[PDB]
Each structure stands twice: as C-alpha cells, then as structure tokens.
Scaffold this motif. Structure first.
Motif, PDB file in Angstrom:
ATOM      1  N   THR A   1      27.477 -23.470   9.506  1.00  0.00           N
ATOM      2  CA  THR A   1      27.523 -23.230  10.906  1.00  0.00           C
ATOM      3  C   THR A   1      26.970 -21.803  11.233  1.00  0.00           C
ATOM      4  O   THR A   1      26.359 -21.562  12.292  1.00  0.00           O
ATOM      5  N   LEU A   2      27.100 -20.883  10.315  1.00  0.00           N
ATOM      6  CA  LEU A   2      26.427 -19.657  10.548  1.00  0.00           C
ATOM      7  C   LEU A   2      25.032 -19.502   9.974  1.00  0.00           C
ATOM      8  O   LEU A   2      24.490 -18.399  10.064  1.00  0.00           O
ATOM      9  N   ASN A   3      24.414 -20.560   9.412  1.00  0.00           N
ATOM     10  CA  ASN A   3      22.967 -20.445   8.985  1.00  0.00           C
ATOM     11  C   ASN A   3      22.068 -19.839  10.093  1.00  0.00           C
ATOM     12  O   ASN A   3      21.465 -18.763   9.959  1.00  0.00           O
ATOM     13  N   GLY A   4      22.010 -20.525  11.229  1.00  0.00           N
ATOM     14  CA  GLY A   4      21.224 -20.020  12.374  1.00  0.00           C
ATOM     15  C   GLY A   4      21.560 -18.594  12.711  1.00  0.00           C
ATOM     16  O   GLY A   4      20.700 -17.851  13.070  1.00  0.00           O
TER      17      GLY A   4
ATOM     18  N   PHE B   1      18.023 -11.755  11.088  1.00  0.00           N
ATOM     19  CA  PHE B   1      16.893 -11.158  10.423  1.00  0.00           C
ATOM     20  C   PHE B   1      15.693 -11.341  11.328  1.00  0.00           C
ATOM     21  O   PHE B   1      14.766 -10.493  11.333  1.00  0.00           O
ATOM     22  N   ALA B   2      15.657 -12.452  12.072  1.00  0.00           N
ATOM     23  CA  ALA B   2      14.430 -12.631  12.867  1.00  0.00           C
ATOM     24  C   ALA B   2      14.431 -11.584  14.016  1.00  0.00           C
ATOM     25  O   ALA B   2      13.399 -10.845  14.177  1.00  0.00           O
ATOM     26  N   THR B   3      15.558 -11.464  14.743  1.00  0.00           N
ATOM     27  CA  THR B   3      15.546 -10.445  15.765  1.00  0.00           C
ATOM     28  C   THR B   3      15.343  -9.074  15.163  1.00  0.00           C
ATOM     29  O   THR B   3      14.757  -8.248  15.728  1.00  0.00           O
ATOM     30  N   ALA B   4      15.853  -8.806  14.004  1.00  0.00           N
ATOM     31  CA  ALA B   4      15.682  -7.472  13.572  1.00  0.00           C
ATOM     32  C   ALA B   4      14.259  -7.252  13.127  1.00  0.00           C
ATOM     33  O   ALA B   4      13.893  -6.124  13.005  1.00  0.00           O
ATOM     34  N   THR B   5      13.471  -8.252  12.761  1.00  0.00           N
ATOM     35  CA  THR B   5      12.153  -7.913  12.184  1.00  0.00           C
ATOM     36  C   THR B   5      11.043  -8.360  13.102  1.00  0.00           C
ATOM     37  O   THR B   5       9.882  -8.162  12.808  1.00  0.00           O
ATOM     38  N   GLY B   6      11.404  -8.981  14.226  1.00  0.00           N
ATOM     39  CA  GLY B   6      10.399  -9.304  15.193  1.00  0.00           C
ATOM     40  C   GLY B   6       9.966 -10.742  15.206  1.00  0.00           C
ATOM     41  O   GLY B   6       9.100 -11.016  15.942  1.00  0.00           O
ATOM     42  N   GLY B   7      10.522 -11.644  14.386  1.00  0.00           N
ATOM     43  CA  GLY B   7      10.179 -13.111  14.397  1.00  0.00           C
ATOM     44  C   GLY B   7      10.236 -13.825  13.014  1.00  0.00           C
ATOM     45  O   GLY B   7      10.411 -13.157  12.014  1.00  0.00           O
ATOM     46  N   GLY B   8      10.072 -15.155  12.939  1.00  0.00           N
ATOM     47  CA  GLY B   8      10.043 -15.839  11.640  1.00  0.00           C
ATOM     48  C   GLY B   8       9.115 -15.218  10.606  1.00  0.00           C
ATOM     49  O   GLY B   8       9.524 -14.755   9.566  1.00  0.00           O
TER      50      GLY B   8
ATOM     51  N   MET C   1      17.879  -4.093   6.795  1.00  0.00           N
ATOM     52  CA  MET C   1      19.091  -4.549   6.190  1.00  0.00           C
ATOM     53  C   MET C   1      20.212  -3.970   7.040  1.00  0.00           C
ATOM     54  O   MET C   1      21.111  -4.733   7.463  1.00  0.00           O
ATOM     55  N   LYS C   2      20.149  -2.663   7.346  1.00  0.00           N
ATOM     56  CA  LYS C   2      21.205  -2.091   8.133  1.00  0.00           C
ATOM     57  C   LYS C   2      21.346  -2.874   9.441  1.00  0.00           C
ATOM     58  O   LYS C   2      22.428  -3.234   9.796  1.00  0.00           O
ATOM     59  N   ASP C   3      20.255  -3.148  10.141  1.00  0.00           N
ATOM     60  CA  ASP C   3      20.275  -3.975  11.321  1.00  0.00           C
ATOM     61  C   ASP C   3      20.889  -5.298  11.031  1.00  0.00           C
ATOM     62  O   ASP C   3      21.903  -5.636  11.590  1.00  0.00           O
ATOM     63  N   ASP C   4      20.366  -6.063  10.106  1.00  0.00           N
ATOM     64  CA  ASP C   4      21.030  -7.304   9.845  1.00  0.00           C
ATOM     65  C   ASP C   4      22.555  -7.160   9.642  1.00  0.00           C
ATOM     66  O   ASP C   4      23.325  -8.063  10.090  1.00  0.00           O
ATOM     67  N   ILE C   5      22.973  -6.098   8.901  1.00  0.00           N
ATOM     68  CA  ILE C   5      24.387  -5.907   8.641  1.00  0.00           C
ATOM     69  C   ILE C   5      25.097  -5.804   9.972  1.00  0.00           C
ATOM     70  O   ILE C   5      26.146  -6.451  10.300  1.00  0.00           O
ATOM     71  N   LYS C   6      24.511  -4.993  10.799  1.00  0.00           N
ATOM     72  CA  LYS C   6      24.988  -4.825  12.141  1.00  0.00           C
ATOM     73  C   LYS C   6      25.141  -6.135  13.007  1.00  0.00           C
ATOM     74  O   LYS C   6      26.203  -6.409  13.693  1.00  0.00           O
ATOM     75  N   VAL C   7      24.127  -7.031  12.936  1.00  0.00           N
ATOM     76  CA  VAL C   7      24.313  -8.220  13.695  1.00  0.00           C
ATOM     77  C   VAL C   7      25.501  -8.950  13.114  1.00  0.00           C
ATOM     78  O   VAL C   7      26.376  -9.401  13.896  1.00  0.00           O
ATOM     79  N   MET C   8      25.613  -8.948  11.781  1.00  0.00           N
ATOM     80  CA  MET C   8      26.682  -9.698  11.146  1.00  0.00           C
ATOM     81  C   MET C   8      28.018  -9.043  11.413  1.00  0.00           C
ATOM     82  O   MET C   8      29.024  -9.685  11.443  1.00  0.00           O
ATOM     83  N   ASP C   9      28.072  -7.751  11.617  1.00  0.00           N
ATOM     84  CA  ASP C   9      29.406  -7.227  11.819  1.00  0.00           C
ATOM     85  C   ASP C   9      29.938  -7.625  13.184  1.00  0.00           C
ATOM     86  O   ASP C   9      31.101  -7.447  13.460  1.00  0.00           O
TER      87      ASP C   9
ATOM     88  N   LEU D   1      13.835 -20.676   9.121  1.00  0.00           N
ATOM     89  CA  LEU D   1      13.223 -19.892   8.076  1.00  0.00           C
ATOM     90  C   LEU D   1      13.040 -20.654   6.736  1.00  0.00           C
ATOM     91  O   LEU D   1      12.117 -20.377   5.942  1.00  0.00           O
ATOM     92  N   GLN D   2      13.928 -21.578   6.426  1.00  0.00           N
ATOM     93  CA  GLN D   2      13.919 -22.062   5.057  1.00  0.00           C
ATOM     94  C   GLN D   2      12.690 -22.993   4.892  1.00  0.00           C
ATOM     95  O   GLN D   2      12.425 -23.580   3.823  1.00  0.00           O
ATOM     96  N   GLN D   3      11.907 -23.109   5.966  1.00  0.00           N
ATOM     97  CA  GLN D   3      10.692 -23.928   5.906  1.00  0.00           C
ATOM     98  C   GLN D   3       9.876 -23.461   4.714  1.00  0.00           C
ATOM     99  O   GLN D   3       9.014 -24.130   4.279  1.00  0.00           O
TER     100      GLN D   3
END
Ligand SMILES: [Cl-]
Length: 383
Positions: free
Chosen positions: A159-162, A168-175, A197-205, A345-347
């Motif tokens: 349920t948290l895959n998306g 990661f997509a918002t933090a890096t600008g897209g797929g 990574m720090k950004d991603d960590i941040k979205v996850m926190d 992404l997993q495409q």
C-alpha cells in the motif's frame, strides 16, 4: 466467417466487456470474438506466447516486462501508425514504446494519491498541501486538533509502494529521473547523504510524525485501513485509485477527496500508475484486419463511455465524459495521461516486492541507514 480471440485479464469487467463484444458483432456480422477468462491468466499467457500459441488480441499490462521482452522479440503488431491511436490522450501510449514504436493501446490506467475526508478538512479548517513542508505541517496540525492523520496498513507494505515511488519521483523531478538515481546508477551509489536521499527520507518521515497513524496500524491490512478511513477513524490514507470502490461501500458519512503527493514546491506534485484496460495484437494473427477492427471499436467514444460509466477508472480516450471536479478521484487524476502521471517505476525493475518492504520497514523502524543499505541490496543485483 471469421472468429478471433481476446485473451482478457480484467476479470471483473467481463460482463460489460462481452456486452460490448456482442454489439460490435451485432454490427459486424462477419466476425466472431470469444472472450477468455482463465484463472492464473498471467502464467497461462506467458506459456502460450512462448509456445507461440498467441491470442489475437491481448489485454496485456504495458508496464509488464513481458511486453517489453515480447515486443522487442516480434510478438506484437506495431501500432504507431494506426489512426485510432490518434484517439489516446497526449503522447500517452508512447510512454510504453519499444524501440520507439508503440505496441499497445492503453484505454484506462490507475493512479495513486492521498484520499482525504473533506467534511473533516472543512470543519477543521485544513488545506490540501502543496509542498512537502505543508504536508508535514498538515499532519502535525491534525494530530493537534486531536485526530488521526493516516490509515496505514502495516501488514500490506505494497500500500505504500506508490508513496515511496512518488517520494523519489518528486524529489528528483520525475520517473526517468527517479530511475536514474536508483536503478541506472552504479552499484552502491545510493548513499545516505545524497540530497535526494535526504529528501526521500523527509517525504517518508511524514509517515512517522508522532501520532500520525491509527492504533495498531502495525498489523493492519488493506481492508482494515479502508474501514478506518470510511469510518472517520482517520482523515487520510495513501493508496491507488482502485480503493475508491471499496471505500464507497462502507457508505462513508462524508464526501471523499484525493490529492496528489506534493513535491518540494508548489506546482510540482506528481502521481504514478499504469495501463489497466490495455491492448496489443499478435504480429502473427490470422485475420489481422479483424483484430484491428476491434481495437478501433473500443477506441470509439460511445464505446469507451459505456465501459467507463461502470469501471470509473481514468481513461485515456478523448470524447468520453469523465467524472468532474468534485468526484472523489478528481484531484488524484487532475493531470492523468500527462507527464506528471508517471508509469510505475518498476517498469524497469526486475521486481518490486523488496521495495514495498524496505518502504514499510522504514515506516516501522526509522532506520535511515538500513533503508539505504536495503536499497542497494535491492537494486545492486541490477547487473
Ligand atoms: Cl504513531
């Protein structure tokens, strides 16, 4: 008087689908279409394609690494030049091309986002967020107003895959970007002190503000989390647009909304998803002209419209009248079929399961380095 096969994978639509099959036939008296709905239809199809007993028309999921491999072997007709393809939004099918050709008509697709309780939001004076900082404050503010920000199914990491893919997509600008950072980078290049990574960590926190989730979410499952949501037990919950149906059924007591995950700034949110009712054609069918006849049928509006009024998933066909600015999925799909609606992404992954897990594990433990490690362990056998 010819007869062709549509190996369908969409089991729950089969009524309205045969329904359609008939009235295409009701007016093509020189074509039969028999509609296949075998169990284990994923593995049935793989065996056959490889055995060369390929169906005339396949409902095949275009993010699939069947389709990439099959197409780039020569199993499917090149539909770039068909005129009924004109009928897909945007460049949309092109997002699944192989070697720059298109081999599948994506009629509808899922999307992913945050469902939320509007009545709640109204009464609590709360705004949909439009940046990571605003999301994070929205969760704090809800905890303070004495309610529960999230329903989270601790036992259904998917349920948290998306949610994480969107981080990661918002933090890096897209797929394309996200996959560059993650999957096409050198081995062990994912590093805990990367800005990304720090950004991603941040979205996850945002998922581990203190008080963000419902009691015992640790061992909650999808169907559980749906319930909490429809009850009011929480205000929000990350999930696909498939949920809406389930959610509608606890007959919730308020109007449902959805919003797309924000990025670091305004105007920068993003959503992810892929083809669902999607079609390709054997490069080796007998009666080719007939297949093509049938796809172009499905691409007709009055046809689609008839599938949509029931399925309700965002559809990439033009001249279908879709649900409007206050349907529950309106926000989540406000840019569907554009470039801010990434393909999963997993495409270009060899799998995802490991990912859903490094995702929940982190929500569960907080272990930042553990996730970075988890991640290269996951992607590294990408050579
Ligand atoms: Cl908590």
């Amino acid at each position: 008087t010819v007869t062709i096969e549509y190996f369908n994978q969409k089991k729950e639509m089969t009524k309205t689908l045969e329904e359609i099959t008939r009235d295409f036939e009701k007016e093509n008296p020189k074509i039969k279409v028999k509609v296949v709905n075998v169990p284990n239809a994923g593995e049935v199809l793989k065996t056959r394609v490889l055995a060369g007993d390929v169906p005339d028309v396949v409902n095949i999921y275009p993010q699939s690494i069947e389709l990439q491999e099959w197409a780039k072997a020569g199993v499917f007709e090149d539909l770039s030049n068909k005129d009924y393809l004109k009928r897909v939004k945007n460049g949309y099918a092109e997002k699944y091309a192989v070697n720059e050709k298109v081999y599948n008509v994506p009629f509808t697709a899922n999307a992913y986002g945050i469902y939320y309780n509007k009545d709640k939001f109204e009464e609590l004076g709360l705004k949909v967020p439009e940046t990571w900082d605003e999301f994070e404050q929205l969760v704090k503010d809800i905890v303070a107003k004495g309610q529960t920000p999230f329903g989270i199914a601790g036992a259904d990491a998917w349920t948290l895959n998306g949610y994480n893919q969107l981080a990661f997509a918002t933090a890096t600008g897209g797929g394309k970007e996200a996959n560059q950072y993650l999957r096409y980078s050198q081995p062990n290049a994912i590093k805990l002190s990367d800005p990304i990574m720090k950004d991603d960590i941040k979205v996850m926190d945002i998922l581990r503000i203190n008080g963000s989730k419902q009691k015992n979410w640790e061992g909650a499952g999808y169907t559980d989390v749906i319930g909490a949501f429809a009850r009011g037990d929480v205000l929000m919950t990350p999930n696909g647009s498939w949920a809406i149906t389930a959610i509608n059924e606890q007959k919730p007591n308020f109007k449902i909304g959805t919003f797309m995950i924000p990025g670091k700034e305004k105007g920068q949110s993003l959503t992810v998803g892929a083809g669902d009712l999607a079609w390709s054609i054997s490069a080796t069918t007998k009666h080719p002209k007939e297949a093509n006849a049938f796809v172009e049928y499905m691409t007709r509006p009055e046809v689609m419209q008839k599938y949509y009024d029931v399925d309700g998933s965002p559809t990439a066909i033009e001249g279908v009248k879709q649900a409007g600015e206050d349907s529950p999925l309106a926000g989540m799909t406000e840019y569907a079929f554009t470039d801010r609606h990434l393909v999963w992404l997993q495409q270009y992954w060899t799998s995802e399961a490991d990912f859903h897990t490094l995702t929940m594990n982190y929500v569960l433990t907080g272990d930042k380095q553990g996730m970075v490690n988890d991640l290269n362990a996951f992607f590294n056998p990408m050579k």
